[PDB]
Structure 1
Amino acid sequence: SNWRPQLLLLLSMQWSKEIIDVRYLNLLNLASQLKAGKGLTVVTAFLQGDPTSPDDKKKGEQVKARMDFDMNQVRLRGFAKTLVHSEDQVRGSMSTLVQSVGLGGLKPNTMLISWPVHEREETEYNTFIEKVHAASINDMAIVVAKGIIDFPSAVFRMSGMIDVYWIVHDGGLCLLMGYLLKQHKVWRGCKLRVIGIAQESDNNVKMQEDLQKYVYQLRIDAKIMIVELAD
């Protein structure tokens, strides 16, 4: 197996020639830190417009050309594509893209998206859960970055803790992601810590032992700590 994330990014923000969106750049930075110059990441942007219009196709190529440049700046190897869709067709456009990506090539196995930007008002969220469902029904993991505006770019060298919270079932996936991040220089100065949350039935001692052995099986250097849920 030796499963590693083959990333598909889905971007659904507005594009303007006057600004560059930092949340978007920071999501590319996070992808690049996960991949450490390896693999082929697909980055797709969804652009509202007329999908038969020459003007909107020209806009989509400009946005693709910006994505190619930005991916190269952050050393994220892969491909960029801009999809044009009608306003009322965004749902089918996003779902069909996740279905159709990788035809005749390596298929992504992990979707990377950002947490919705604005607070719930009574759309941006309706898109979000659509993306979550699309990942799972297409056999993809999903990774959601929350607080991406504050995530570090390549000029930073983080130190301190990366905490993975482990619960009754889960899997080793969270742990792997932390480990991959720690391989990049941005996070290399961080210590990795696995925090197990114990139920009222589990005894803290044997949960510590189990996670210690499991982490050792994964060949990941991490400190194990057990915390009790109830109070």
Structure 2
Amino acid sequence: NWRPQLLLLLSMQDVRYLNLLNLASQLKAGKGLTVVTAFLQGDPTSPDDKKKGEQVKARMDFDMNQVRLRGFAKTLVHSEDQVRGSMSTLVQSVGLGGLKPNTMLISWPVHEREEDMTEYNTFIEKVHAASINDMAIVVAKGIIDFPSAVFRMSGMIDVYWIVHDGGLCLLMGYLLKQHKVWRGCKLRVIGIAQESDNNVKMQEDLQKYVYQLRIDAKIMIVELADPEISKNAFERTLLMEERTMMTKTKKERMKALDRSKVSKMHTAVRLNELLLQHSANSQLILLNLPKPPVHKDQQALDDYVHYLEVMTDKLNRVIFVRGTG
């Protein structure tokens, strides 16, 4: 009976903003209390930037009211080279006064021009900040944009349950299904079977699970080692590896790290082929968000983001979800 209490993080300078408000409102369906915080780059000691920030806050309060999202907004002014500590401090200090959000909601980072680099470069920090402060995190990904309360969807919502998460992905999909925007859809729960798993038992146990929770969902089990999917993904990967192509203890440590990199890339591509085969036309896909790298290198962030962009390439809407423990 746990439900998300949301904390939205945004960077200010329009589409991703209103999309995020719409998703937040549909998750909450008028209940709860949501905190929306916008980060505005400027001088935190300047009165002119302060009232600029309170104009933004007023505009955000109006918007929340329009999408019928119950809560309040807050603007935070930071200087450019301090966005990192300002964000992580907000997460540690939110609800010093009483409320405590248990769920962070953010947008997938953009990284096409130089303006976006502050939001791209803090992505891993935000993911770590959530789990370290006992919050789930939700990451919305999509250039195909998100419906408002004016629309009625009725296609597929696919929950891929491929990690032990206590059913967190499933809860998010079930919660959307309760809102009128998504109520018409068909919920599907897709398990991915490894070579040693028992597909029939996975199907039966998932069916008994949703039956006992009285959830109207279809159950499907797909094979990660599918011959066709594996051949296709391998051939695709080799072509990708050629584009971006344009003593003993530390030796073998180097080989092992490269091995795992190549292996992780082949896996991402195989997952993408599987998602395209089964959910190319799905209106919503919910996935676990994998553990981010422990290291702060720029290559580590670039690799993490690329892994996930490759994995979810050419899909419509993806929501990544990650809990705490």
TM-score (norm 1): 0.92
Report deviation, 1:23. 1.2
Cross-structure match for 1:13: 12
Cross-structure match for 2:50: 57
Deviation string for 1:42-98 (max 9, x for gaps)?
A: 000001111111100000000000110000000000010000111111111000000
Report deviation, 1:146. 0.1
Contact kept in structure 1, 2:88 and 2:129, CA below 8 Å: yes
Q: Does 1:223 align with 2:218?
A: yes
Contact kept in structure 2, 1:23 and 1:149, CA below 8 Å: no
Report deviation, 1:213. 2.2
Distance 1:153 1:3 in 2: 25
TM-score (norm 2): 0.66
Gaps of 5+ in 2: 227-325
Distance 1:134 1:216 in 2: 36
Larger Rg: 2
Deviation string for 1:136-192 (max 9, x for gaps)?
A: 100100000001651111111111110000114233111111111011111111010
Question: CA 1:148–1:111 in structure 2 vs 1: closer, same or farther (change >3 Å)?
Answer: farther
Report deviation, 1:220. 2.2
Distance 2:12 2:203 in 1: 43
Partner SS for 1:150:
coil
Distance 1:94 1:80 in 2: 15
Higher helix share: 2
Gaps of 5+ in 1: 15-20
Distance 1:84 1:201 in 2: 53
Q: Kindly tell me the number of residue pairs found equivalent between the two proteins.
A: 224
Contact kept in structure 1, 2:43 and 2:49, CA below 8 Å: yes
Report deviation, 1:105. 1.5
Distance 1:149 1:39 in 2: 28
Contact kept in structure 2, 1:114 and 1:148, CA below 8 Å: no
Report deviation, 1:216. 3.0
Report deviation, 1:119. 3.8
Distance 2:12 2:122 in 1: 11
Distance 2:191 2:114 in 1: 35
Contact kept in structure 1, 2:12 and 2:41, CA below 8 Å: no
Deviation string for 1:99-154 (max 9, x for gaps)?
A: 11111312011100000123488943211111111101001000000016511111
Deviation string for 1:183-217 (max 9, x for gaps)?
A: 11111110100001011111111001121222234
Cross-structure match for 2:170: 175
Question: CA 1:175–1:148 in structure 2 vs 1: closer, same or farther (change >3 Å)?
Answer: farther
Contact kept in structure 1, 2:161 and 2:191, CA below 8 Å: yes
Question: CA 1:160–1:203 in structure 2 vs 1: closer, same or farther (change >3 Å)?
Answer: same
Question: CA 1:103–1:219 in structure 2 vs 1: closer, same or farther (change >3 Å)?
Answer: farther
Distance 1:80 1:39 in 2: 14
Work out the percentage of aligned pairs sharing the same amino acid. Answer: 100
Cross-structure match for 2:73: 80
Alignment root-mean-square deviation, CA? 1.7
